[PDB]
Design a binder for this molecule. Structure first.
Ligand SMILES: COC(=O)[C@H]1O[C@H](O[C@@H]2[C@H](O)[C@@H](O)[C@@H](O[C@@H]3[C@H](O)[C@@H](O)[C@@H](O[C@@H]4[C@H](O)[C@@H](O)[C@@H](O)O[C@@H]4C(=O)O)O[C@@H]3C(=O)OC)O[C@@H]2C(=O)OC)[C@H](O)[C@@H](O)[C@H]1O[C@H]1O[C@H](C(=O)O)[C@H](O[C@H]2O[C@H](C(=O)O)[C@H](O)[C@H](O)[C@H]2O)[C@H](O)[C@H]1O
Length: 342
């Protein structure tokens, strides 16, 4: 039994439908009863913030139901201030028990076009983060099944609670899955994109930039997935599996890189093409304003039974034992939450 509380459609000749997803979401009664919205095929140029618990979106098809907007961190608002990374997101989830199924979410900020702009071009943005999907500290138990997430830098921002991504596609370049949330990915294609602006022997990007607090058991966990290059033009050894993001954070003694954000990224039973070279370092500013480097060997970066040409084994790429791998089951990672669709 599957019934819809609202339907979004591009066609008025279709039936009794909403024209925009934002309108359908808004039409939901106040409260926490399940509200399920069907979204028919089409490109919906919308930015959405979800604040109602137990809201559920279902696209007609992942290929054809698209939610898209173009916003970079460096994009200016009306008052002349920047949107920022969090603010750049096409979809923001700030509610509990959200699900999205069979749809694509894009940030259409044209990173390559931006980089190709002349250095003197005042429209050339430096803050090139452009988030497709953002799960905030308020968005626990967020479930994404058969969803495609599209971006370049900072595609997926997972913060706070638990999120589960299943049968998914996620594309990007730099730090394209990042944040301090517990995010489990199963049977996903993680797509590393070509960068025309990167010189022959330099790094193109990093799949993950976890900022997981050291006292939090699970950060980014990728299982039974495929780490793939967008094209044959993506060079060998051009992408890192992760680098440690220690976010600039306001403390009592100032604003600087959080020392206790010692991120976790764990890959289990995942294929990797040879664009992968391993893990990498990342810099921030310390309490004195000096550059500080955070190293992968000091971070919680692990693999278990990786395969494919990018799956090399050395000292610099720590491996889980069988016993340790057993700690990364869905049951263990998500605790008492079993992700279910309406
Ligand atoms: C999610 O994290 C990010 O997206 C990070 O973005 C930034 O990373 C930069 C850069 O954008 C990225 O491409 C990369 O660049 C490296 C290298 O560092 C460059 O010098 C460089 O080499 C150039 C060229 O590629 C090469 O061919 C040669 O010619 O040299 C060139 C050159 O040197 O000029 O390019 C490299 C490259 O492309 O690698 C693939 O790394 C950069 C970097 O790490 O600099 C320190 C930010 O700088 C990062 O901090 C990170 O951004 C996140 O964290 C920020 C922070 O302050 O911690 C900031 O977050 C804060 O604001 C948030 C918000 O506004 O919402 C939020 O509140 C958060 O809590 C708070 O901490 C950013 O907003 C956030 O995205």
């Amino acid at each position: 039994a599957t019934t819809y509380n609202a339907v979004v459609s591009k066609s008025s000749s279709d039936g009794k439908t909403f024209k925009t997803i934002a309108d359908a979401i808004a039409s939901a009664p106040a409260g926490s009863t399940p509200f399920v919205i069907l979204i028919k095929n089409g490109v919906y140029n919308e930015r959405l913030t979800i604040t109602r618990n137990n809201l559920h979106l279902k696209g007609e098809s992942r290929n054809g139901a698209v939610i898209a907007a173009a916003t970079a961190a460096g994009t200016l608002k009306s008052d002349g201030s920047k949107w920022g990374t969090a603010g750049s997101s096409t979809i923001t989830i700030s509610a509990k028990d959200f699900s999205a199924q069979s749809l694509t979410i894009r940030n259409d900020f044209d990173f390559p076009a931006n980089q190709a702009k002349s250095d003197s071009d005042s429209s050339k943005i430096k803050d090139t983060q452009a988030v497709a999907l953002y799960v905030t500290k308020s968005g626990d138990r967020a479930y994404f099944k058969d969803v495609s997430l599209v971006g370049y830098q900072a595609t997926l921002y997972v913060s706070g609670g638990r999120s589960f991504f299943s049968d998914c596609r996620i594309s990007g370049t730099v730090d394209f899955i990042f944040g301090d949330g517990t995010a489990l990915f199963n049977n996903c294609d993680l797509v590393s994109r070509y960068r025309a602006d990167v010189k022959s022997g330099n790094v193109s990007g990093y799949l993950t930039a976890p900022s997981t607090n050291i006292n939090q058991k699970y950060g980014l966990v990728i299982t039974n997935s495929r780490v793939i290059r967008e094209s044959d033009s993506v060079p060998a050894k051009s992408y890192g599996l992760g680098r440690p993001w220690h976010p600039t954070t306001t403390f009592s003694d100032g604003r600087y890189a959080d020392p206790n954000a010692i991120g976790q990224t764990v890959f289990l039973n995942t294929s990797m093409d040879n664009h992968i070279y391993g893990w990498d370092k990342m810099s921030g500013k310390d309490k004195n304003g000096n550059t500080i480097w955070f190293n992968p060997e000091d971070s919680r970066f692990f693999e278990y039974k990786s395969y494919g040409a990018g799956a090399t084994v050395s000292k610099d790429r720590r491996q889980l034992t069988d016993a340790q791998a057993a700690e990364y089951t869905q049951s263990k990672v998500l605790g008492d939450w079993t992700p279910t669709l309406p």
